[PDB]
Short mmCIF file of C-alpha atoms (C1' of nucleotides) in Angstrom, two decimals:
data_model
loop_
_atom_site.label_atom_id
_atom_site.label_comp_id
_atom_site.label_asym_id
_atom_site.label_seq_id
_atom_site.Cartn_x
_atom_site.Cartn_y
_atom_site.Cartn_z
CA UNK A 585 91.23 -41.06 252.73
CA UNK A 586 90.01 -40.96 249.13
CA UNK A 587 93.21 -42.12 247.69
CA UNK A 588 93.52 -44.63 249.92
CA UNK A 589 89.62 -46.09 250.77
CA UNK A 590 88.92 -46.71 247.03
CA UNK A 591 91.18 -46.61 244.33
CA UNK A 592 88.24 -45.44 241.92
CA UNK A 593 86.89 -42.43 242.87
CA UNK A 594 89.18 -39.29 241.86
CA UNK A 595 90.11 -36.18 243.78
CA UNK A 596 90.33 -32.90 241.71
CA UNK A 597 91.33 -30.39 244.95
CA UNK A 598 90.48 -26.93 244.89
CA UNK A 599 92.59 -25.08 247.72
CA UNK A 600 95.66 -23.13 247.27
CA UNK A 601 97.35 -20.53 244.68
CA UNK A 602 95.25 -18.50 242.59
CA UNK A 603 97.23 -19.91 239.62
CA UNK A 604 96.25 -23.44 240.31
CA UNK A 605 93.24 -23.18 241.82
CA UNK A 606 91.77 -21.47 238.21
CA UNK A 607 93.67 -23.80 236.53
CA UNK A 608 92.13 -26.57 238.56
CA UNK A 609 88.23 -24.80 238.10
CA UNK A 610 89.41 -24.24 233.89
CA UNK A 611 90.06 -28.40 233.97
CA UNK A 612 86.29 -29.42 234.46
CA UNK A 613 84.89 -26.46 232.73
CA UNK A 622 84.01 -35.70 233.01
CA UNK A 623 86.54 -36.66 235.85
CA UNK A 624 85.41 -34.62 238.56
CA UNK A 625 84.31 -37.55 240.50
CA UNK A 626 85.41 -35.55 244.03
CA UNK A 627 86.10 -31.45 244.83
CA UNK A 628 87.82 -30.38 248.25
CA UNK A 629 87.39 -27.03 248.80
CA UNK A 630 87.24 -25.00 252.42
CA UNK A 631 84.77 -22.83 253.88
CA UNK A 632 86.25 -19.43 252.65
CA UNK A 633 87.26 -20.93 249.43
"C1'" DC B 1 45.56 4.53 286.89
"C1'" DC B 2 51.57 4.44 286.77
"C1'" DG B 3 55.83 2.16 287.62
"C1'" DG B 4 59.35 -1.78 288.69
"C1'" DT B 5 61.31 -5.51 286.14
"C1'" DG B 6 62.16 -9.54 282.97
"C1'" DC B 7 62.89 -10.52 278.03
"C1'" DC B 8 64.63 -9.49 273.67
"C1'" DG B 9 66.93 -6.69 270.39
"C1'" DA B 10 70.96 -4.05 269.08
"C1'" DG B 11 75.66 -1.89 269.61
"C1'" DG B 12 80.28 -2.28 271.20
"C1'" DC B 13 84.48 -4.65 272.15
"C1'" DC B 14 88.10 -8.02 271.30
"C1'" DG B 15 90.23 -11.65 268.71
"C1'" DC B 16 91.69 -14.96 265.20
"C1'" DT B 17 91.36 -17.29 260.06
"C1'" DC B 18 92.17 -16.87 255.76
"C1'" DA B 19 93.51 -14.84 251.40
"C1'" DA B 20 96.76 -11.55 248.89
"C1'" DT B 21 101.63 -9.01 248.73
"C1'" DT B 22 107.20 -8.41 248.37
"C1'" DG B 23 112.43 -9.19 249.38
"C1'" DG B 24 115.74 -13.22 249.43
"C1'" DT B 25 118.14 -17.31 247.25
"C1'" DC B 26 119.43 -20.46 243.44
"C1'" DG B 27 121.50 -20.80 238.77
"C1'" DT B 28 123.34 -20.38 234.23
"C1'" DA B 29 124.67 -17.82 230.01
"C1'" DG B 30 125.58 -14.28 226.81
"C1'" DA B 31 128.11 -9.87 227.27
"C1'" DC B 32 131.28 -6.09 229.84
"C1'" DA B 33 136.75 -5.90 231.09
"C1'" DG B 34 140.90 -6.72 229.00
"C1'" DC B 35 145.46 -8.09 226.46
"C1'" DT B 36 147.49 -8.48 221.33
"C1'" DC B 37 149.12 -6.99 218.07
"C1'" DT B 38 148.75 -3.78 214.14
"C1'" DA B 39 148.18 -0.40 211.30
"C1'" DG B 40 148.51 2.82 209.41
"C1'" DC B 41 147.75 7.20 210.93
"C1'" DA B 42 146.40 10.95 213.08
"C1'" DC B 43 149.05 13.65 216.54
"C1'" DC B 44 153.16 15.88 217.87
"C1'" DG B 45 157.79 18.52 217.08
"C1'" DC B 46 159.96 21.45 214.31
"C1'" DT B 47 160.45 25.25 210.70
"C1'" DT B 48 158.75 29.53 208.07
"C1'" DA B 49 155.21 32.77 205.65
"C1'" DA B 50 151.65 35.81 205.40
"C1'" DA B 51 147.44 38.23 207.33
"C1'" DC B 52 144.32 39.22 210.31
"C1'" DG B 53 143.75 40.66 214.77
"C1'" DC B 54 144.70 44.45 217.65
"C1'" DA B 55 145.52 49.23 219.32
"C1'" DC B 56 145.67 54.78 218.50
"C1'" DG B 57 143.83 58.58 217.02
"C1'" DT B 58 139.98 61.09 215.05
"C1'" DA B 59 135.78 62.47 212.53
"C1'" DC B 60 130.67 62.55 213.31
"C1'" DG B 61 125.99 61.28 214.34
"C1'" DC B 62 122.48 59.06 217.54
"C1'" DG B 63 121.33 58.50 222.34
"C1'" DC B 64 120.34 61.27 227.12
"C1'" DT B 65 119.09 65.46 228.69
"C1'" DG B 66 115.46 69.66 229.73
"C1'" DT B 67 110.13 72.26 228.97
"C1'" DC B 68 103.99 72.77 227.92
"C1'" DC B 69 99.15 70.05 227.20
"C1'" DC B 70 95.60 67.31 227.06
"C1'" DC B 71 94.35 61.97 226.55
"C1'" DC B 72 94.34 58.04 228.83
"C1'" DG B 73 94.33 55.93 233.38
"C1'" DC B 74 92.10 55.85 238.06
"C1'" DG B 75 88.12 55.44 240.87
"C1'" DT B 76 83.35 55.31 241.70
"C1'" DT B 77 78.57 53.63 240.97
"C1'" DT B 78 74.84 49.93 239.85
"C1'" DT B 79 73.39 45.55 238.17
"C1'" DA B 80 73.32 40.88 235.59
"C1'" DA B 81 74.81 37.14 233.20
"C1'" DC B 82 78.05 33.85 234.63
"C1'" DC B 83 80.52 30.81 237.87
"C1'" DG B 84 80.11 27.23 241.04
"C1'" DC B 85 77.61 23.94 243.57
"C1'" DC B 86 74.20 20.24 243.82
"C1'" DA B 87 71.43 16.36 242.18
"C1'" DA B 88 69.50 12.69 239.29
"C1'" DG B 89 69.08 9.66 234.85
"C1'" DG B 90 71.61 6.44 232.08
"C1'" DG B 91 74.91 4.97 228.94
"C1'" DG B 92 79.52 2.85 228.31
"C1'" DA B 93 83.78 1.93 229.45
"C1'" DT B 94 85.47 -1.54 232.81
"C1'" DT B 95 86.55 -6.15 234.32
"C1'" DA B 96 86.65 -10.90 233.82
"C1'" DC B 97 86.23 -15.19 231.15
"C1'" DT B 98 86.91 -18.58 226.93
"C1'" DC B 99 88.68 -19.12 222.33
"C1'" DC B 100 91.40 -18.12 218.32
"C1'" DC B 101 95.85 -16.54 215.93
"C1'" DT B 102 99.44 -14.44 214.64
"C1'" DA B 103 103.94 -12.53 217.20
"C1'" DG B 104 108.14 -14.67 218.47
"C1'" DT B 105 111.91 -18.04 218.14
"C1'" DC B 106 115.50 -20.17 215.06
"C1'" DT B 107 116.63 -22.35 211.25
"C1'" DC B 108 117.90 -22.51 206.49
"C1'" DC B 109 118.80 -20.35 202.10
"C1'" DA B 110 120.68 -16.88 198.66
"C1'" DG B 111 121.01 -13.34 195.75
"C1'" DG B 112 120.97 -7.77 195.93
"C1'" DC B 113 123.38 -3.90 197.06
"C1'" DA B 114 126.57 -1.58 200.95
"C1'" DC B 115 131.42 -0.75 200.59
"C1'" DG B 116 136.04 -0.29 199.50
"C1'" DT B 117 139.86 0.52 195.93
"C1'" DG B 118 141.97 2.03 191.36
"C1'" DT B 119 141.90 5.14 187.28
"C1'" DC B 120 141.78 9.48 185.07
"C1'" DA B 121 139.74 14.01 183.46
"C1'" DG B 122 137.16 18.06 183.72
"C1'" DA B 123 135.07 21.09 186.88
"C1'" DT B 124 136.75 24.59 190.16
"C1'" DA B 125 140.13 27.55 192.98
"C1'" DT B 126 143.10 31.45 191.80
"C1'" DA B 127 145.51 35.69 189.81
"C1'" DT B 128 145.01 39.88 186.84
"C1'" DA B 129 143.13 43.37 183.83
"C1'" DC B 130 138.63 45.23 182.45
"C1'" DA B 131 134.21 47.79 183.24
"C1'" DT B 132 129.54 48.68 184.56
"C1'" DC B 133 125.80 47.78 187.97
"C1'" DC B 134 124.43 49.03 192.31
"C1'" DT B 135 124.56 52.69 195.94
"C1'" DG B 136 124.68 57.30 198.54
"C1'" DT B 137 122.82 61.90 197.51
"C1'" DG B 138 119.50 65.12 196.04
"C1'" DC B 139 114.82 66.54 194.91
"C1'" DA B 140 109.72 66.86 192.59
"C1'" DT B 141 105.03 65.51 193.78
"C1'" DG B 142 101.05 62.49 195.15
"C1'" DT B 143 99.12 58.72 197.71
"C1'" DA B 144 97.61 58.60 201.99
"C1'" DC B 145 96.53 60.35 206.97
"C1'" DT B 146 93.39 63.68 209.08
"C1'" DC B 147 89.21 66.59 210.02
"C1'" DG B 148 84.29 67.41 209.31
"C1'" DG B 149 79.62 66.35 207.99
"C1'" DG B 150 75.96 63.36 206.13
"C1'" DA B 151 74.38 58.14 204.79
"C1'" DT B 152 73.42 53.26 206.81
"C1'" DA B 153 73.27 50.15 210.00
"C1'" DT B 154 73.08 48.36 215.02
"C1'" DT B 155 71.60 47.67 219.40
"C1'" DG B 156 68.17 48.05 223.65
"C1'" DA B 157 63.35 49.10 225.92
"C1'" DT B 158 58.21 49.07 225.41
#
DNA sequence: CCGGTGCCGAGGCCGCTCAATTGGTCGTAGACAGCTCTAGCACCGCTTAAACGCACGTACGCGCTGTCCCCCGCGTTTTAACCGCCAAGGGGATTACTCCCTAGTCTCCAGGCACGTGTCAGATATATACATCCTGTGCATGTACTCGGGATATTGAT
């Protein structure tokens, strides 16, 4: 829905592998228009 | 006054929902099998020569074997300083994160010393005659162990 609604705003997901996901949280630590993250997460 | 009963609060059950673990498959590349001489070379076959290893007596000590006496071990007692357990304060090693940096890869370069061969000569095995230094034996004596009695600590209980 975000990649398709608008192509401005810009999705920086945070859900799966530990790898990526702390890659992913290293990244911002600015882009970060949008974060997807679940409950547990 | 006490007691039945609704309301609320808590404990118990069950179940996913999700995040972390570990054996299975793909794949490619440097290194275990495996000739191929070769190469000269150790290993084998075939001889003797000398000596050490082996066995038989036989002399001759150093281990087993029998008898008295106390000194050290056994066994008891009480009691006390130590072991073991418990508990609390707090410091520091742990765990996780970002940032820096030198290990690791490989590439290129090149001159120093491992490494082999060739030459030759003097240090070392070896045999024999010479001889004297070390070794078994014998024996005097004195440094050291032992017994006894008087100093100086050296601990424990008021």
């Amino acid at each position: 829905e975000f990649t398709r609604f608008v192509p401005k705003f810009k999705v920086l997901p945070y859900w799966g592998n530990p790898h990526d996901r702390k890659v992913i949280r290293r990244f911002w630590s600015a882009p970060f228009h949008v974060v997807i993250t679940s409950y547990q997460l």
